[PDB]
Design a protein around this ligand. Sequence first.
Ligand SMILES: *[C@@H]1O[C@H](CO)[C@@H](O[C@@H]2O[C@H](CO)[C@@H](O)[C@H](O)[C@H]2NC(C)=O)[C@H](O)[C@H]1NC(C)=O
Ligand SMILES: *[C@@H]1O[C@H](CO)[C@@H](O[C@@H]2O[C@H](CO)[C@@H](O)[C@H](O)[C@H]2NC(C)=O)[C@H](O)[C@H]1NC(C)=O
Ligand SMILES: *[C@@H]1O[C@H](CO)[C@@H](O[C@@H]2O[C@H](CO)[C@@H](O)[C@H](O)[C@H]2NC(C)=O)[C@H](O)[C@H]1NC(C)=O
Ligand SMILES: *[C@@H]1O[C@H](CO)[C@@H](O[C@@H]2O[C@H](CO)[C@@H](O)[C@H](O)[C@H]2NC(C)=O)[C@H](O)[C@H]1NC(C)=O
Ligand SMILES: *[C@@H]1O[C@H](CO)[C@@H](O)[C@H](O)[C@H]1NC(C)=O
Ligand SMILES: *[C@@H]1O[C@H](CO)[C@@H](O)[C@H](O)[C@H]1NC(C)=O
Ligand SMILES: *[C@@H]1O[C@H](CO)[C@@H](O)[C@H](O)[C@H]1NC(C)=O
Ligand SMILES: *[C@@H]1O[C@H](CO)[C@@H](O)[C@H](O)[C@H]1NC(C)=O
Ligand SMILES: *[C@@H]1O[C@H](CO)[C@@H](O)[C@H](O)[C@H]1NC(C)=O
Ligand SMILES: *[C@@H]1O[C@H](CO)[C@@H](O)[C@H](O)[C@H]1NC(C)=O
Ligand SMILES: *[C@@H]1O[C@H](CO)[C@@H](O)[C@H](O)[C@H]1NC(C)=O
Ligand SMILES: *[C@@H]1O[C@H](CO)[C@@H](O)[C@H](O)[C@H]1NC(C)=O
Lengths: 136, 407, 99, 99, 50
Amino acid sequence: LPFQQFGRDIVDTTDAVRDPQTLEILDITPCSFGGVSVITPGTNTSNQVAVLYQGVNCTEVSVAIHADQLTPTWRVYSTGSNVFQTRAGCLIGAEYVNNSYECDIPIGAGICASYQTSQSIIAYTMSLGAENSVAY
Amino acid sequence: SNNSIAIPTNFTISVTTEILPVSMTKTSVDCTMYICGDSTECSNLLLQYGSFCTQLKRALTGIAVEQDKNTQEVFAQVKQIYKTPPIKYFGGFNFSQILPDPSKPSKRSPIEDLLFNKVTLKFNGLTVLPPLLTDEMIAQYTSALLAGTITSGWTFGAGPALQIPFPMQMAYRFNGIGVTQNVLYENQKLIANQFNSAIGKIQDSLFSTPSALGKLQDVVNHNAQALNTLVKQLSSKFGAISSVLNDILSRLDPPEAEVQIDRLITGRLQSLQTYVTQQLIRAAEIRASANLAATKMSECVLGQSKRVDFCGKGYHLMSFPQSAPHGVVFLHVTYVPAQEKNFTTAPAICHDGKAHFPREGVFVSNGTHWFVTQRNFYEPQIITTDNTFVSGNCDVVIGIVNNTVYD
Amino acid sequence: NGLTVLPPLLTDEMIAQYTSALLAGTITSGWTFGAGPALQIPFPMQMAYRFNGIGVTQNVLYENQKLIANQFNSAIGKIQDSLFSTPSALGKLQDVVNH
Amino acid sequence: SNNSIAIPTNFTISVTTEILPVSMTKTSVDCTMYICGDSTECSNLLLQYGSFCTQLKRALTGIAVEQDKNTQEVFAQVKQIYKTPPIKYFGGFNFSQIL
Amino acid sequence: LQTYVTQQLIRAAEIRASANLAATKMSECVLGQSKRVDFCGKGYHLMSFP
Ligand SMILES: *[C@@H]1O[C@H](CO)[C@@H](O[C@@H]2O[C@H](CO)[C@@H](O)[C@H](O)[C@H]2NC(C)=O)[C@H](O)[C@H]1NC(C)=O
Ligand SMILES: *[C@@H]1O[C@H](CO)[C@@H](O[C@@H]2O[C@H](CO)[C@@H](O)[C@H](O)[C@H]2NC(C)=O)[C@H](O)[C@H]1NC(C)=O
Ligand SMILES: *[C@@H]1O[C@H](CO)[C@@H](O[C@@H]2O[C@H](CO)[C@@H](O)[C@H](O)[C@H]2NC(C)=O)[C@H](O)[C@H]1NC(C)=O
Ligand SMILES: *[C@@H]1O[C@H](CO)[C@@H](O[C@@H]2O[C@H](CO)[C@@H](O)[C@H](O)[C@H]2NC(C)=O)[C@H](O)[C@H]1NC(C)=O
Ligand SMILES: *[C@@H]1O[C@H](CO)[C@@H](O)[C@H](O)[C@H]1NC(C)=O
Ligand SMILES: *[C@@H]1O[C@H](CO)[C@@H](O)[C@H](O)[C@H]1NC(C)=O
Ligand SMILES: *[C@@H]1O[C@H](CO)[C@@H](O)[C@H](O)[C@H]1NC(C)=O
Ligand SMILES: *[C@@H]1O[C@H](CO)[C@@H](O)[C@H](O)[C@H]1NC(C)=O
Ligand SMILES: *[C@@H]1O[C@H](CO)[C@@H](O)[C@H](O)[C@H]1NC(C)=O
Ligand SMILES: *[C@@H]1O[C@H](CO)[C@@H](O)[C@H](O)[C@H]1NC(C)=O
Ligand SMILES: *[C@@H]1O[C@H](CO)[C@@H](O)[C@H](O)[C@H]1NC(C)=O
Ligand SMILES: *[C@@H]1O[C@H](CO)[C@@H](O)[C@H](O)[C@H]1NC(C)=O
């Protein structure tokens, strides 16, 4: 209405502001944030790791990395077929296969990771078991 | 009366439901973001408080892992994924409402679809983590559990799965509650119709009643309400001059803003501790419920139970699982007697000065003739030495009635 | 100072009535009233069924009826003394009140 | 020994007891009365503390409702109130102490 | 007040566990005959009274 200035949500956090110069309403949104998780086999095995950025689209982390706008400074090797998108977040450092094995390291919504064969880290959709059919 | 008995002459097949919560939402919290948004001074002050933030993280991580353990325990009972035969003729019994439907993209039963449509329904450093098992995988587990118990009975829960036709399995299950086999073989069509109608009524009983899934609804509502309270607690003063760190620092002298910052820090830390303790207690309750659900899955779905009123009200026959959001639904099938009648009874029979007791049944009289019957379904027989034993002379027993026993 | 105690919804008489109904059902019907319509049966026959349910044939009860009834009566009789003399019997309920 | 067995020749009927708690006392609390008896200044100061008092009320109300649910679950098993016959002869068994 | 309420919540959870056990015992020892060892007394169960 022609007399308000701000926009307030249910929990009373501002989420819309009108520009004072020109009367235009702008929607605001917090900058991206979340946790960071590290997937590793034993240090007795090797020293390679994979990193999961939780609940973020892969393009945003790629852009922030390319413009050095991220807080934890790893800049893990990101070129090639190692950036994968999951419902849990952006997974960097493991390649996605289309086989199905038993779950080794749980990651997210039906995705696990393991150390296979040279050697590398892979991600796959977990297998519930061997299909069977009884002769009724 | 001391010489009168009642024996049923007809029965009934009934189906009831049971809803049990299994798991709740997994959340994680970041202390620095929640307490001290981006100010460096607040974080530096919070450093002189110890390990009050490692403990909250550890507690929430433990809750999150237990939430997946619960679902793994309830649903991953079986080891192999069983498939149902292409043809769906099972002696006249109809299972369409509970078996997966290929036309639906998600491969869910109609009743599972009804439940899914019925329940239904990033802050400041607060996140929500997805569960490890997607809904399709839980549906696949449920489908395997249903296919195993139709084509094999209860044998697949103790070793290799051995097939058997469905009417024979039902005959075994009648035999397991004290009713002979021939009752089912002589009332097959009627019993199948009763079962079909009982399954049919479930859709209406679930759909019309709104307050059926109150437990799952409350599970969702409490978790939403706690988070809303936690976020809206961020705008309280706790005795300070303002609720914004920037406005405190802008118009105050650095050795004087410490008091206000400390007050805000203490208030917010107390709020976090309250939230975590409440979460821990709720998690313990949910774990108890999930353990009960796992026991019911083992004992009512993979076998036949003799515990009274454990798998429904009546004499248990079998049960079927269905997957619901954050929980499970059980469909218990029981046997119920009906249409009783007066009778006169006696404890023993004297013949040639020899007492007689029935091997399996109770002596009964229709006013003129004496028979022997099984004590769950009226089916008189003729007294003979092939269904009685002697064991006694004629006189110690009280209320003995003498008649003729043939050979 | 601002602290109240609320009465329970069920009075003690209603709980006593529930207990009385549970006792009357299991004497004149056995276990049949917990699964459908209640079907009557004389008490010695119900006891014969219950002996049959633990691996002892029927005729034992019919030949030892009077002795078994006396044993049951005396066993019920001793309960009053065992409960009354011992003071620490209801420790659980006492602790519930005390806490 | 590998060829010897023991078999009982007489029995005994015994009665034991078991006590279990079911429900506890229901209480409610008023924040303003307890914390700030009647002073207006104290209540005004307490206003700047958030929803620390709605939560306590909700928790106590939940406990109070669960206390009634417990008693309802244990005792209201049956659906009808059964009556015992006027005569109390049950084959020689005596039930006077429990009826 | 907060200490009092937390203690009450824990005690209530314990009481609820006990009441669930009591309901199961009412169902299985009073409305039927039990085969579980030492559930409805020490010996071979016959019947129970509340
Ligand atoms: C046992 O009960 C069933 C169910 O009521 C009876 O079947 C009904 O019989 C009547 C009369 O023949 C029919 O009108 C109904 O349509 C039947 N019900 C169904 C669902 O088909 C059956 O007759 C009863 N058995 C005895 C011996 O009385
Ligand atoms: C099992 O029950 C379903 C539910 O009614 C039956 O589906 C019906 O099938 C007939 C054709 O025989 C259709 O005309 C109806 O419209 C269907 N009803 C619904 C709700 O879809 C099914 O036929 C039954 N199973 C068998 C083998 O007949
Ligand atoms: C089984 O035990 C009962 C109980 O001890 C025996 O009954 C007792 O018998 C003796 C001797 O006849 C009497 O002095 C007692 O008064 C009886 N007890 C009661 C309570 O009346 C019974 O004799 C035993 N049976 C056998 C075969 O030895
Ligand atoms: C059941 O036991 C009670 C308890 O003793 C019996 O009550 C006694 O009855 C006699 C009369 O037969 C009185 O002289 C006693 O004083 C009573 N005792 C008490 C403690 O009240 C009762 O008689 C027994 N049942 C039957 C049917 O005899
Ligand atoms: C403020 O100045 C700009 C500069 O041209 C003008 O376009 C705008 O209309 C002015 N705002 C108002 C409210 O007049
Ligand atoms: C990520 O962003 C692109 C474009 O910004 C969008 O097309 C894509 O759907 C996003 N990822 C997901 C999982 O939605
Ligand atoms: C894996 O194989 C499937 C065929 O079922 C194919 O659709 C998919 O693209 C493959 N994954 C690859 C090539 O990464
Ligand atoms: C019990 O049986 C006797 C005969 O043995 C009979 O006279 C009496 O009426 C019966 N009791 C009842 C309540 O019918
Ligand atoms: C059994 O006998 C009682 C006593 O006469 C009577 O009230 C009852 O109706 C009878 N049962 C049936 C099914 O008629
Ligand atoms: C009892 O059953 C016999 C069966 O042989 C029958 O002849 C008789 O008429 C029946 N009596 C009554 C009262 O129904
Ligand atoms: C058969 O029973 C009647 C009545 O109980 C009894 O009078 C008669 O003596 C009995 N028969 C014999 C051979 O004792
Ligand atoms: C076991 O049986 C053998 C004969 O089969 C006998 O010699 C031996 O003494 C028995 N063992 C014991 C401990 O009595």
